[PDB]
Scaffold this active site. Structure first.
Site, PDB file in Angstrom:
ATOM      1  N   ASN A  35       0.835  -1.199   0.000  1.00  0.00           N
ATOM      2  CA  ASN A  35       0.000   0.000   0.000  1.00  0.00           C
ATOM      3  C   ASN A  35       0.872   1.252   0.000  1.00  0.00           C
ATOM      4  O   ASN A  35       1.913   1.288   0.649  1.00  0.00           O
ATOM      5  CB  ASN A  35      -0.924   0.008   1.231  1.00  0.00           C
ATOM      6  CG  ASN A  35      -2.048   1.049   1.134  1.00  0.00           C
ATOM      7  OD1 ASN A  35      -2.607   1.458   2.151  1.00  0.00           O
ATOM      8  ND2 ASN A  35      -2.382   1.474  -0.085  1.00  0.00           N
ATOM      9  N   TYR A  69      -7.330  13.309  -0.974  1.00  0.00           N
ATOM     10  CA  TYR A  69      -7.034  12.508   0.196  1.00  0.00           C
ATOM     11  C   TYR A  69      -6.613  13.385   1.362  1.00  0.00           C
ATOM     12  O   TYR A  69      -5.841  14.323   1.187  1.00  0.00           O
ATOM     13  CB  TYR A  69      -5.924  11.521  -0.205  1.00  0.00           C
ATOM     14  CG  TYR A  69      -5.361  10.660   0.897  1.00  0.00           C
ATOM     15  CD1 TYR A  69      -5.932   9.421   1.200  1.00  0.00           C
ATOM     16  CD2 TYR A  69      -4.244  11.074   1.631  1.00  0.00           C
ATOM     17  CE1 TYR A  69      -5.402   8.618   2.209  1.00  0.00           C
ATOM     18  CE2 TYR A  69      -3.707  10.275   2.643  1.00  0.00           C
ATOM     19  CZ  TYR A  69      -4.292   9.053   2.925  1.00  0.00           C
ATOM     20  OH  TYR A  69      -3.772   8.267   3.922  1.00  0.00           O
ATOM     21  N   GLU A  78      -9.942   9.437   7.996  1.00  0.00           N
ATOM     22  CA  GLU A  78      -9.291   9.428   6.684  1.00  0.00           C
ATOM     23  C   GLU A  78     -10.360   9.607   5.606  1.00  0.00           C
ATOM     24  O   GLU A  78     -11.239   8.758   5.488  1.00  0.00           O
ATOM     25  CB  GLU A  78      -8.551   8.094   6.474  1.00  0.00           C
ATOM     26  CG  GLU A  78      -7.558   8.042   5.290  1.00  0.00           C
ATOM     27  CD  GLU A  78      -7.136   6.612   4.950  1.00  0.00           C
ATOM     28  OE1 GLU A  78      -8.005   5.748   4.821  1.00  0.00           O
ATOM     29  OE2 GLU A  78      -5.899   6.369   4.832  1.00  0.00           O
ATOM     30  N   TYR A  80     -11.813  10.643   1.501  1.00  0.00           N
ATOM     31  CA  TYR A  80     -11.515  10.513   0.079  1.00  0.00           C
ATOM     32  C   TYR A  80     -12.607  11.106  -0.805  1.00  0.00           C
ATOM     33  O   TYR A  80     -13.785  11.104  -0.475  1.00  0.00           O
ATOM     34  CB  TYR A  80     -11.473   9.042  -0.340  1.00  0.00           C
ATOM     35  CG  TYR A  80     -10.367   8.195   0.202  1.00  0.00           C
ATOM     36  CD1 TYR A  80     -10.482   7.582   1.442  1.00  0.00           C
ATOM     37  CD2 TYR A  80      -9.244   7.925  -0.572  1.00  0.00           C
ATOM     38  CE1 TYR A  80      -9.503   6.705   1.899  1.00  0.00           C
ATOM     39  CE2 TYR A  80      -8.264   7.054  -0.128  1.00  0.00           C
ATOM     40  CZ  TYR A  80      -8.402   6.446   1.108  1.00  0.00           C
ATOM     41  OH  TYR A  80      -7.444   5.564   1.530  1.00  0.00           O
ATOM     42  N   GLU A 172      -3.150   6.584  -4.951  1.00  0.00           N
ATOM     43  CA  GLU A 172      -2.990   5.504  -3.997  1.00  0.00           C
ATOM     44  C   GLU A 172      -3.012   4.173  -4.718  1.00  0.00           C
ATOM     45  O   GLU A 172      -3.803   3.988  -5.635  1.00  0.00           O
ATOM     46  CB  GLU A 172      -4.096   5.532  -2.933  1.00  0.00           C
ATOM     47  CG  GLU A 172      -4.149   4.251  -2.103  1.00  0.00           C
ATOM     48  CD  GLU A 172      -5.007   4.368  -0.853  1.00  0.00           C
ATOM     49  OE1 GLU A 172      -5.647   5.422  -0.654  1.00  0.00           O
ATOM     50  OE2 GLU A 172      -5.034   3.398  -0.065  1.00  0.00           O
TER      51      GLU A 172
HETATM   52  C1  LIG Z   1      -5.490   5.189   4.103  1.00  0.00           C
HETATM   53  O1  LIG Z   1      -4.312   5.435   3.299  1.00  0.00           O
HETATM   54  C2  LIG Z   1      -3.038   4.805   3.643  1.00  0.00           C
HETATM   55  C3  LIG Z   1      -2.794   4.763   5.177  1.00  0.00           C
HETATM   56  O2  LIG Z   1      -2.449   6.066   5.634  1.00  0.00           O
HETATM   57  C4  LIG Z   1      -1.083   6.358   5.944  1.00  0.00           C
HETATM   58  O3  LIG Z   1      -0.853   6.002   7.320  1.00  0.00           O
HETATM   59  C5  LIG Z   1       0.499   6.304   7.765  1.00  0.00           C
HETATM   60  C6  LIG Z   1       0.764   7.816   7.645  1.00  0.00           C
HETATM   61  O4  LIG Z   1       2.084   8.108   8.078  1.00  0.00           O
HETATM   62  C7  LIG Z   1       0.588   8.239   6.181  1.00  0.00           C
HETATM   63  O5  LIG Z   1       0.778   9.645   6.062  1.00  0.00           O
HETATM   64  C8  LIG Z   1      -0.830   7.868   5.740  1.00  0.00           C
HETATM   65  O6  LIG Z   1      -1.011   8.204   4.369  1.00  0.00           O
HETATM   66  C9  LIG Z   1      -4.030   4.266   5.962  1.00  0.00           C
HETATM   67  O7  LIG Z   1      -3.705   3.079   6.674  1.00  0.00           O
HETATM   68  C10 LIG Z   1      -5.242   4.003   5.059  1.00  0.00           C
HETATM   69  F1  LIG Z   1      -6.384   3.740   5.862  1.00  0.00           F
END
Ligand SMILES: *[C@H]1OC[C@@H](O[C@@H]2OC[C@@H](O)[C@H](O)[C@H]2O)[C@H](O)[C@H]1F
Length: 185
Positions: A35, A69, A78, A80, A172
């Site tokens: 991811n 985002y 979070e 979107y 993403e």
């Molecule tokens: C939504 O997108 C990815 C993830 O978010 C990350 O979590 C860690 C943080 O440091 C980053 O800036 C974020 O983008 C999240 O698990 C998911 F639900």
């Protein structure tokens, strides 16, 4: 507008070649990833902001989203605004629809359990979604009037936190490959 935030997060899986370009431009080349989220925007999100962007390149080979985002705290959320995707259209619990910037978006809510967040480590949090019913054509100057979404979510009991974190137009991906080139302003 001038972007002041560069988002580049990956869980470490596969290859993610993120390029921090000039102005509000950035590009991403990814392959066999886990991811990841890459994008440009603002350090402090705003419910009244109008986001402009142009995806000169949108070529996901699998699961990937071209979406607004961002995050809020108190509570941790979070959110979107998905304009386009790859092979998978994100969905969840249907709440309703909202018309904005020439398109119709479905509203959904989902929950993440024991997942990474802006607060580091792992926790459980809610996700707010606005997903276009059909993919928005790319290569043109597109606009996302966020206030329309914020107001639509509110009418459905979807309230954002009082502490705003970053807000970006991102790419993403999840266990996929692809390419993207986006300019944000
Ligand atoms: C939504 O997108 C990815 C993830 O978010 C990350 O979590 C860690 C943080 O440091 C980053 O800036 C974020 O983008 C999240 O698990 C998911 F639900």
């Amino acid at each position: 507008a001038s972007t002041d935030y560069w988002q580049n997060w990956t869980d470490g899986g596969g290859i993610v070649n993120a390029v921090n370009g000039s102005g509000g431009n950035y590009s991403v080349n990814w392959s066999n990833t886990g991811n990841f989220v890459v994008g440009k925007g603002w350090t402090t999100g705003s419910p009244f902001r109008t986001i402009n962007y142009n995806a000169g390149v949108w070529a996901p080979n699998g699961n990937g989203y071209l979406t607004l985002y961002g995050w809020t705290r108190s509570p941790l959320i979070e959110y979107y605004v998905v304009d386009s995707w790859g092979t998978y259209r994100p969905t969840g619990t249907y709440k309703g629809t909202v018309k904005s910037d020439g398109g119709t978006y479905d509203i959904y809510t989902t929950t993440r359990y024991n997942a990474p967040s802006i607060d580091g480590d792992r926790t459980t949090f809610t996700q707010y979604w606005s997903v276009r019913q059909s993919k928005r054509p790319t290569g043109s100057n597109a606009t996302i009037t966020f206030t329309n979404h914020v107001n639509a979510w509110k009418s459905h009991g979807m309230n954002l936190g009082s502490n705003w974190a970053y807000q970006v137009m991102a790419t993403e991906g999840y266990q996929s490959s692809g390419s993207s080139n986006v300019t944000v302003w």
